Amino acid sequence: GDVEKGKKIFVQKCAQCHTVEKGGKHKTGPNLHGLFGRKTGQAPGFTYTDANKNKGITWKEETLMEYLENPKKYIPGTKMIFAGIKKKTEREDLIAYLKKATNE
């Protein structure tokens, strides 16, 4: 719950292939705008994978955590293989930033 350390983990983790900035520009990957609430593979832009287009679950706070600790195992098929998170606060914090970052 530290948008501060959450941002740090973001600039070095997700900023790589993301934007998480409203009215931004999805680069080397889709955006996470108003993510918390939309169904998997629902963002119009990047060619989402069938697994994400399967619409099995919806992005949320906790859902993102399990997804942040194993993005692949959560929705097998999703195009994203880099590195999951280690500690919980890393996910919560990281998610705290993804919230205020995808809200602005």
Is residue 6 near ligand HEC by the rule CB under 6 A? no
Residue 74 token pair: 């959560």
Quote the distance between the C-alpha of residue 27 and its chain's center.
14
Q: How far apart are CA 52 and CA 101, in angstroms?
A: 22
Establish if 26 lies at the interface with ligand HEC (CB under 6 A). no
Structure-block tokens of residue 41 = 């593979």
Q: Give the one residue of 7, 19, 41, 93 binding ligand HEC; rule: CB under 6 A.
A: 41
Binding site for ligand HEC (CB under 6 A): 13-14, 16-18, 28-30, 32, 35, 40-41, 43, 46, 48-49, 52, 59, 68, 78-80, 82, 98
